[PDB]
Amino acid sequence: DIIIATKNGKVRGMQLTVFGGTVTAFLGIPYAQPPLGRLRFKKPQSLTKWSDIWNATKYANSCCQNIDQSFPGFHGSEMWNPNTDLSEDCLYLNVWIPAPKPKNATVLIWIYGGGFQTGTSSLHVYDGKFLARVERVIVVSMNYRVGALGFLALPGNPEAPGNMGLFDQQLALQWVQKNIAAFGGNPKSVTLFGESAGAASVSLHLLSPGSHSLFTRAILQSGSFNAPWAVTSLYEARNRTLNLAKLTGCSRENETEIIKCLRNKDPQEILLNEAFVVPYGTPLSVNFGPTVDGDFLTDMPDILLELGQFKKTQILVGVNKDEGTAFLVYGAPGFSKDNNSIITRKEFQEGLKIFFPGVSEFGKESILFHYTDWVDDQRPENYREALGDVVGDYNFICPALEFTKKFSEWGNNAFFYYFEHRSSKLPWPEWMGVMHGYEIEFVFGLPLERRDQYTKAEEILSRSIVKRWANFAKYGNPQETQNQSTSWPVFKSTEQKYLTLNTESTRIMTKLRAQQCRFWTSFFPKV
Numbered sequence: 162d163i164i165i166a167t168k169n170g171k172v173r174g175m176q177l178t179v180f181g182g183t184v185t186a187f188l189g190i191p192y193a194q195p196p197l198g199r200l201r202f203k204k205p206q207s208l209t210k211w212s213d214i215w216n217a218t219k220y221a222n223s224c225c226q227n228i229d230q231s232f233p234g235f236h237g238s239e240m241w242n243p244n245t246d247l248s249e250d251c252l253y254l255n256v257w258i259p260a261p262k263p264k265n266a267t268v269l270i271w272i273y274g275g276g277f278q279t280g281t282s283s284l285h286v287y288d289g290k291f292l293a294r295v296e297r298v299i300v301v302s303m304n305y306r307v308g309a310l311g312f313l314a315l316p317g318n319p320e321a322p323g324n325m326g327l328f329d330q331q332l333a334l335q336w337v338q339k340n341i342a343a344f345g346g347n348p349k350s351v352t353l354f355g356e357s358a359g360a361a362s363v364s365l366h367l368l369s370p371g372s373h374s375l376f377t378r379a380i381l382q383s384g385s386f387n388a389p390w391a392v393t394s395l396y397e398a399r400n401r402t403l404n405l406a407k408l409t410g411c412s413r414e415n416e417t418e419i420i421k422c423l424r425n426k427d428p429q430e431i432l433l434n435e436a437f438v439v440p441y442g443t444p445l446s447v448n449f450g451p452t453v454d455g456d457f458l459t460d461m462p463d464i465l466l467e468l469g470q471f472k473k474t475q476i477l478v479g480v481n482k483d484e485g486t487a488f489l490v491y492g493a494p495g496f497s498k499d500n501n502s503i504i505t506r507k508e509f510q511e512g513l514k515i516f517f518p519g520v521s522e523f524g525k526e527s528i529l530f531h532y533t534d535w536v537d538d539q540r541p542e543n544y545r546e547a548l549g550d551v552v553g554d555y556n557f558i559c560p561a562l563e564f565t566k567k568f569s570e571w572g573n574n575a576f577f578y579y580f581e582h583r584s585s586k587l588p589w590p591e592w593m594g595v596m597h598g599y600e601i602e603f604v605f606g607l608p609l610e611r612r613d614q615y616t617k618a619e620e621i622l623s624r625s626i627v628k629r630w631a632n633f634a635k636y637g638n639p640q641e642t643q644n645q646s647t648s649w650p651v652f653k654s655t656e657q658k659y660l661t662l663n664t665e666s667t668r669i670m671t672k673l674r675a676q677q678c679r680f681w682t683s684f685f686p687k688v
């Protein structure tokens with residue numbers, strides 16, 4: 162029996178057998194008053210002390226969210242849907258500590274993605290027990306509010322100030338500072354890592370002054386705040402808030418009377434209405450996301466990045482080879498996970514209208530012009546691969562690259578990776594390649610489980626990635642120093658070296674997607 166005295170009370174964990182060893186898991190520790198009733202849409206409130214032994218032996222409720230129902234019964238989509246009950250009462254976190262108890266272990270804090278509308282820390286691919294067992298770090302992950310319940314914005318109004326889900330994250334980082342030493346953890350050695358909207362979240366903690374003292378280093382997988390989907394403007398946010406008010410019958414004149422009316426609405430009413438607050442949205446539609454609230458985020462983050470206004474520390478940043486492919490089968494005409502998705506020039510043009518709905522004809526033409534000059538015009542995959550590249554370069558790869566160049570220009574070490582391995586267990590079709598989100602299982606060491614039917618070469622690749630991530634968190638330097646590994650050079654703004662992650666030869670390359678990213682980063686924002 163394993164009871165720890167946290168600052169708010171005693172929690173009891175459970176014992177886990179992992180690779181002939183043991184991990185102690187604390188699942189579902191609460192870190193805030195449940196944001197219910199009059200607390201819905203507010204910032205999270207501190208938790209009152211309990212005098213019993215809290216039983217932290219099962220994953221807690223997931224936060225209210227809409228489910229991906231586009232492919233019922235398909236593991237490729239459903240692996241991402243919540244695996245606990247949905248509830249507003251969802252502000253809980255998990256802790257995996259090595260056995261026996263460490264003395265001063267580095268802590269890894271995971272922040273999941275999901276487009277800021279979905280996600281949960283209880284997902285199988287976020288199980289931190291392998292990192293605890295293998296690298297003797299402490300893995301922490303938290304649930305945070307998402308969708309309108311987490312990011313509805315009436316800027317300046319504390320009844321719904323925006324960025325509540327980011328403050329949920331922040332309060333959990335504070336829990337680790339106040340409590341993790343009781344678990345064997347070193348609160349002075351905390352590395353945030355996250356993927357997609359989780360990665361964008363991590364980058365925003367690098368800008369928020371309130372999070373500066375709550376972590377040491379940061380890892381950003383397939384995401385950063387300067388990606389076009391990551392920050393809702395004050396314009397759209399209030400137009401989206403106001404729409405939601407109309408759809409729910411809550412249009413009032415006193416701006417607080419609106420919030421009051423959305424608080425007697427059942428969570429389902431709010432959820433089913435989030436889809437329509439945007440007139441013509443995209444598959445990547447972040448209906449309710451981070452805004453410039455003037456509390457968590459003091460200015461527009463592009464300006465903060467550009468003028469060096471962020472925590473000075475090391476970062477590890479990276480992207481996958483085919484970020485853009487997953488989105489094509491959520492709306493692009495002619496695409497389907499159940500065929501090879503050979504699309505015509507006309508279908509490609511229609512696809513740009515889907516992903517760039519309010520962009521001018523000239524802007525859409527300029528995308529076509531940059532991506533439709535190929536070596537071979539007979540190649541029938543040409544338009545199919547071009548549209549995936551368009552979506553991935555615009556939405557993920559070029560913003561991550563630009564974040565890395567700009568962040569490192571202020572003098573910190575940065576490490577950039579290009580993940581190009583397609584999991585042998587990937588349930589999506591082959592033409593979709595190295596998809597968005599399918600490095601995560603390698604980062605968490607799932608292929609280290611010999612029973613799970615990954616190949617040997619994947620166990621090795623995961624084993625090395627896990628080492629490099631752990632060395633990064635522990636030492637600010639993501640090297641594998643023992644097994645004659647390729648040395649990972651720092652990403653400098655001149656040479657822009659990066660490391661490729663794959664099962665064969667890990668190489669050092671320069672200036673990833675240079676041509677494509679000059680278009681997206683220099684020319685396209687003019688249109």
Ligand SMILES: *[C@@H]1O[C@H](CO[C@@H]2O[C@@H](C)[C@@H](O)[C@@H](O)[C@@H]2O)[C@@H](O[C@@H]2O[C@H](CO)[C@@H](O)[C@H](O)[C@H]2NC(C)=O)[C@H](O)[C@H]1NC(C)=O
Pocket residue numbers: 264265347349350635
């Ligand atoms: C746990 O270790 C810390 C030292 O942390 C080091 O620095 C961090 C930035 C991180 O990178 C870790 O890997 C390092 O191990 C100890 O902190 C010291 O505390 C004493 C007070 O007793 C203080 O005088 C020292 O200045 C601190 N050292 C540093 C480097 O800041 C802490 O005591 C250790 N905890 C336990 C329980 O042993």
Ligand SMILES: *[C@@H]1O[C@H](CO[C@@H]2O[C@@H](C)[C@@H](O)[C@@H](O)[C@@H]2O)[C@@H](O[C@@H]2O[C@H](CO)[C@@H](O)[C@H](O)[C@H]2NC(C)=O)[C@H](O)[C@H]1NC(C)=O
Pocket residue numbers: 400404407408437438439440
């Ligand atoms: C700001 O919001 C308006 C209002 O959104 C419309 O009504 C909501 C209830 C929701 O159902 C949305 O999908 C609706 O679009 C939007 O502009 C509207 O555009 C549509 C047609 O595209 C049409 O209803 C009206 O022309 C507009 N509604 C008005 C004027 O009330 C759009 O999101 C934003 N419009 C502007 C001008 O900023």
Ligand SMILES: *[C@@H]1O[C@H](CO[C@@H]2O[C@@H](C)[C@@H](O)[C@@H](O)[C@@H]2O)[C@@H](O[C@@H]2O[C@H](CO)[C@@H](O)[C@H](O)[C@H]2NC(C)=O)[C@H](O)[C@H]1NC(C)=O
Pocket residue numbers: 493494495496497499500501502503
């Ligand atoms: C690939 O499939 C898409 C999607 O069509 C559906 O899925 C298929 C697997 C099959 O079950 C079809 O019967 C389904 O309709 C095809 O796109 C459709 O194309 C037809 C005619 O070209 C058109 O009428 C539909 O509107 C299209 N639907 C969508 C969602 O785009 C596409 O033609 C298939 N491509 C190849 C190369 O086989």
Ligand SMILES: O=C(NC[C@H](O)CNCC1CCCCC1)C(c1ccccc1)c1ccccc1
Pocket residue numbers: 227228229237238241275276278279357358390444445446447487488491596597598
């Ligand atoms: O992740 C989103 N929404 C939550 C959805 O319940 C689940 N996602 C679909 C999965 C399919 C394969 C890998 C990716 C996840 C959304 C998004 C928006 C902005 C940035 C990143 C992601 C999105 C993702 C894929 C396709 C369409 C939309």
Ligand SMILES: *[C@@H]1O[C@H](CO[C@@H]2O[C@@H](C)[C@@H](O)[C@@H](O)[C@@H]2O)[C@@H](O)[C@H](O)[C@H]1NC(C)=O
Pocket residue numbers: 162213214216
């Ligand atoms: C919390 O859970 C306890 C679980 O029962 C046993 O507790 C320890 C001693 C281990 O042996 C464990 O494996 C067992 O399952 C309950 O005894 C206790 O009443 C519970 N308390 C609350 C408040 O739910």
Ligand SMILES: *[C@@H]1O[C@H](CO)[C@@H](O)[C@H](O)[C@H]1NC(C)=O
Pocket residue numbers: 415416417418
């Ligand atoms: C809106 O209602 C709140 C609560 O009663 C009140 O404090 C505020 O002054 C009202 N605003 C206006 C403009 O009347």
Ligand SMILES: *[C@@H]1O[C@H](CO)[C@@H](O)[C@H](O)[C@H]1NC(C)=O
Pocket residue numbers: 621624625628641643644
């Ligand atoms: C290095 O190789 C040895 C070979 O036995 C293996 O046990 C070990 O896990 C490897 N280490 C890393 C970090 O890959």
Ligand SMILES: [Cl-]
Pocket residue numbers: 189220221222250
């Ligand atoms: Cl719960």
Ligand SMILES: [Cl-]
Pocket residue numbers: 225247248249428429
């Ligand atoms: Cl519910």
Ligand SMILES: [Cl-]
Pocket residue numbers: 244284285
């Ligand atoms: Cl599961």
Ligand SMILES: [Cl-]
Pocket residue numbers: 240285286
């Ligand atoms: Cl899986």
Ligand SMILES: [Cl-]
Pocket residue numbers: 482
């Ligand atoms: Cl490539």
Ligand SMILES: [Cl-]
Pocket residue numbers: 506538
């Ligand atoms: Cl052509």
Ligand SMILES: [Cl-]
Pocket residue numbers: 527530531680684
């Ligand atoms: Cl061009």
Ligand SMILES: [Cl-]
Pocket residue numbers: 584586587588602
């Ligand atoms: Cl998988």
Ligand SMILES: [Cl-]
Pocket residue numbers: 501542592
């Ligand atoms: Cl093919």
